[PDB]
Amino acid sequence: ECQANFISIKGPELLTMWFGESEANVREIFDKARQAAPCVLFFDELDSIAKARGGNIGDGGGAADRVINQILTEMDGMSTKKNVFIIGATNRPDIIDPAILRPGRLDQLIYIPLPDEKSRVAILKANLRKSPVAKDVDLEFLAKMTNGFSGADLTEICQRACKLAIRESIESEIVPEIRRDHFEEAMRFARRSVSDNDIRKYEMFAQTLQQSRGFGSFRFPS
Amino acid sequence: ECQANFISIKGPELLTMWFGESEANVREIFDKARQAAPCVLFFDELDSIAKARGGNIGDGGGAADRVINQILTEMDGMSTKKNVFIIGATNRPDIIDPAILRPGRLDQLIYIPLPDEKSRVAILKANLRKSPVAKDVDLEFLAKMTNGFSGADLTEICQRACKLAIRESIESEIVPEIRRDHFEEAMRFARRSVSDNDIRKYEMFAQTLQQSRGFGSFRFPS
Amino acid sequence: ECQANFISIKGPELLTMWFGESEANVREIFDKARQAAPCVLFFDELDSIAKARGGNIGDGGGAADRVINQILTEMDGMSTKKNVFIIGATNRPDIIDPAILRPGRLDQLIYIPLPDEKSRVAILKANLRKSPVAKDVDLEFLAKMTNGFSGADLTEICQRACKLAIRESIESEIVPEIRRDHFEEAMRFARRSVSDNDIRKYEMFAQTLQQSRGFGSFRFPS
Ligand SMILES: Cc1cc2c(C(N)=O)cccc2n1-c1nc2c(c(NCc3ccccc3)n1)COCC2
Ligand SMILES: Cc1cc2c(C(N)=O)cccc2n1-c1nc2c(c(NCc3ccccc3)n1)COCC2
Ligand SMILES: Cc1cc2c(C(N)=O)cccc2n1-c1nc2c(c(NCc3ccccc3)n1)COCC2
Numbered sequence: 001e002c003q004a005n006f007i008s009i010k011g012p013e014l015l016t017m018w019f020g021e022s023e024a025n026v027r028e029i030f031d032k033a034r035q036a037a038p039c040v041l042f043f044d045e046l047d048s049i050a051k052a053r054g055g056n057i058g059d060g061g062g063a064a065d066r067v068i069n070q071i072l073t074e075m076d077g078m079s080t081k082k083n084v085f086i087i088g089a090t091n092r093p094d095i096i097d098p099a100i101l102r103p104g105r106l107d108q109l110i111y112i113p114l115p116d117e118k119s120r121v122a123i124l125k126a127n128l129r130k131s132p133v134a135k136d137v138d139l140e141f142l143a144k145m146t147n148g149f150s151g152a153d154l155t156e157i158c159q160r161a162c163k164l165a166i167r168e169s170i171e172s173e174i175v176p177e178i179r180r181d182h183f184e185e186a187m188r189f190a191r192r193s194v195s196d197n198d199i200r201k202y203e204m205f206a207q208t209l210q211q212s213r214g215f216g217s218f219r220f221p222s
Numbered sequence: 223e224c225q226a227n228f229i230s231i232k233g234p235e236l237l238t239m240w241f242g243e244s245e246a247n248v249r250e251i252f253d254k255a256r257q258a259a260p261c262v263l264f265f266d267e268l269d270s271i272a273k274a275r276g277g278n279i280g281d282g283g284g285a286a287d288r289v290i291n292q293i294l295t296e297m298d299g300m301s302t303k304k305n306v307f308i309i310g311a312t313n314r315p316d317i318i319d320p321a322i323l324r325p326g327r328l329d330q331l332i333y334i335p336l337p338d339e340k341s342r343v344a345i346l347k348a349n350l351r352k353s354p355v356a357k358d359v360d361l362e363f364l365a366k367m368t369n370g371f372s373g374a375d376l377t378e379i380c381q382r383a384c385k386l387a388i389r390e391s392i393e394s395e396i397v398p399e400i401r402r403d404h405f406e407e408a409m410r411f412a413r414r415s416v417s418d419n420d421i422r423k424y425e426m427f428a429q430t431l432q433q434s435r436g437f438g439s440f441r442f443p444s
Numbered sequence: 445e446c447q448a449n450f451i452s453i454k455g456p457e458l459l460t461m462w463f464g465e466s467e468a469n470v471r472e473i474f475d476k477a478r479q480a481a482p483c484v485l486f487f488d489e490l491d492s493i494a495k496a497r498g499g500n501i502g503d504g505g506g507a508a509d510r511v512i513n514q515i516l517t518e519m520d521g522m523s524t525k526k527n528v529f530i531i532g533a534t535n536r537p538d539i540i541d542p543a544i545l546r547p548g549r550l551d552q553l554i555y556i557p558l559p560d561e562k563s564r565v566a567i568l569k570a571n572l573r574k575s576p577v578a579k580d581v582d583l584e585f586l587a588k589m590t591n592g593f594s595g596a597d598l599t600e601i602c603q604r605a606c607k608l609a610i611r612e613s614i615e616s617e618i619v620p621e622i623r624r625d626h627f628e629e630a631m632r633f634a635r636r637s638v639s640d641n642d643i644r645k646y647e648m649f650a651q652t653l654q655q656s657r658g659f660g661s662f663r664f665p666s
Contacts (some may be wrong), residue, residue, distance in 0.1 A: 059281075148592075152325055156329075184442060188437060
């Protein structure tokens with residue numbers, strides 16, 4: 001949307017320098033993120049170091065480590081007039097170090113929920129955009145049926161339907177179109193990896209920081 | 223079946239680089255696994271590092287270490303169009319790090335049960351394929367008798383029968399054929415190393431990830 | 445179905461004699477259950493005493509108490525030729541004392557799952573059998589939409605729709621028919637009291653006692 005460059009740093013690249021005690025690697029990451037103006041810096045599974053160290057308690061130490069410290073130092077020294085942007089992604093925000101969320105570094109926190117009915121059709125069609133889809137196979141109804149399903153759950157449904165279609169095509173040689181029955185049968189092994197307790201614990205975090213109470217009704221004098 | 227090359231990495235080779243802090247060894251493993259296209263990469267007792275560190279809890283840290291991190295990094299960077307394939311083997315999947323089982327790396331999990339009656343005959347005949355077997359020695363009945371027996375249990379039964387036959391042949395000098403009595407007597411010291419609690423705990427893991435409930439009966443409108 | 449009498453003993457009646465140290469009350473319960481031949485004896489929330497004492501561990505004692513002991517004594521002394529029948533109901537079977545499940549008393553254990561699509565229509569129509577239901581209000585679709593919903597979840601949906609209809613009827617005086625909009629709007633506050641972890645923990649109990657392994661394929665000689 002911003003016509004900006006994109007740099008992705010997954011968990012293994014972040015945890016490699018933690019184990020290796022070689023911490024000059026973030027230097028070039030932030031250097032090449034700023035020369036490609038405008039760019040966007042994306043940190044995947046930022047909680048990887050916290051999980052590797054234990055998480056909320058772990059050892060006698062807190063939630064502060066060296067790699068996140070280097071990221072904090074590099075982010076503090078950046079120029080606001082540049083168009084470089086840092087995006088952090090995590091699934092466990094309770095073990096994220098509080099100092100990275102301080103105002104001025106990552107003060108903006110937004111919650112990514114489960115895909116809704118409108119967004120699930122997009123996940124199904126993204127998976128099936130390379131496959132022969134029959135006319136009778138209605139993705140709107142399939143997305144309506146699954147409600148608490150994650151993108152991964154729909155992904156494995158599509159993969160299992162494709163596997164069934166491929167197997168039927170192979171065994172039928174001794175049809176080049178995914179049929180309604182393939183999706184109907186593969187719908188039986190429908191998992192739901194995200195539990196309700198997880199949604200509750202993410203919400204407790206969400207309106208932990210919402211706090212829209214107290215000053216809800218204000219009237220100015222004149 | 224695929225006419226592909228095979229590379230086996232046992233537990234000691236994986237745990238040697240963990241203790242030695244020398245982690246360039248996975249680099250050449252994955253390099254020589256990909257140049258021999260088509261190949262299959264097999265990791266034996268992947269939980270060796272987790273057992274050496276403690277397992278489910280162990281120290282204050284979680285289930286993430288450096289060697290599994292290197293394997294994750296190498297697997298993430300591979301090309302899907304190549305025919306290289308990675309197979310992980312473990313006996314304790316509860317202590318396996320969750321990140322290696324993420325979709326895209328080792329999402330496919332299949333359970334290897336105890337050999338059934340048809341498969342136990344194969345284990346017996348594989349062990350006895352180099353030994354003189356008498357006609358009256360019926361392996362079908364022997365495999366039928368042992369039910370909750372592992373391949374190792376049948377292996378030691380065959381080894382003990384061979385030991386008894388060799389000892390009788392040596393002492394009789396002062397017959398070059400394994401007799402029915404050798405197997406009948408060696409059948410007395412029949413162990414069963416796998417307990418029922420183990421089977422129960424493996425199943426709890428199995429339909430932990432099965433979840434074939436909820437969407438079992440679906441009817442399309444038209 | 446058996447044209448038999450029915451006696452229901454809820455949790456409070458069972459826990460009253462536990463606190464009151466007055467344990468002759470089960471005597472008349474079992475006496476009047478057997479004189480009304482044929483009858484059926486139903487014990488609701490049998491785990492109430494275990495919950496009141498702590499459950500799996502609780503105090504230094506085990507899972508045995510006095511009231512369940514009296515029920516065991518009364519059940520052991522009954523005549524099998526009589527048509528009296530005892531049914532125990534519980535939601536936590538992990539804290540149920542093992543001795544009540546011994547063969548001869550309550551050896552038969554069956555699992556009551558969440559209602560399926562066919563059974564959910566019955567729950568909706570049982571709740572709405574006394575209310576004016578509009579023609580366009582399709583209960584089949586409503587039951588299809590809710591999948592992991594308990595009978596209580598559908599019950600509160602129906603109650604909330606009735607409350608909305610009653611409120612609109614009262615405020616409109618200053619219509620005597622539940623409309624499609626009443627159910628559509630009340631569908632927004634749809635709870636799901638039973639979590640997936642609960643279903644998993646009930647299943648672990650279920651094929652704890654299933655054990656259909658080992659002797660799955662048997663062939664007789666002749
Ligand atoms: C293959 C695919 C897998 C996947 C997964 C997953 N855990 O497998 C999760 C989220 C999106 C996913 N996609 C996906 N991939 C794409 C698109 C798309 N739809 C938009 C969207 C994005 C985030 C959210 C909702 C819906 N979804 C759209 O076009 C590009 C590719
Ligand atoms: C000596 C031998 C020991 C052993 C053991 C063991 N813990 O001792 C476990 C599993 C298979 C084993 N084998 C074995 N070895 C072989 C074969 C064979 N049968 C097929 C099979 C494979 C896996 C499973 C079932 C049955 N079994 C077949 O031909 C090659 C050698
Ligand atoms: C008001 C009512 C509430 C309720 C609840 C609840 N937690 O509110 C749970 C289960 C059944 C319930 N019913 C109910 N009540 C009735 C019926 C019926 N349908 C059959 C049925 C039974 C058990 C199971 C499924 C479906 N369901 C049938 O006619 C008699 C009354």
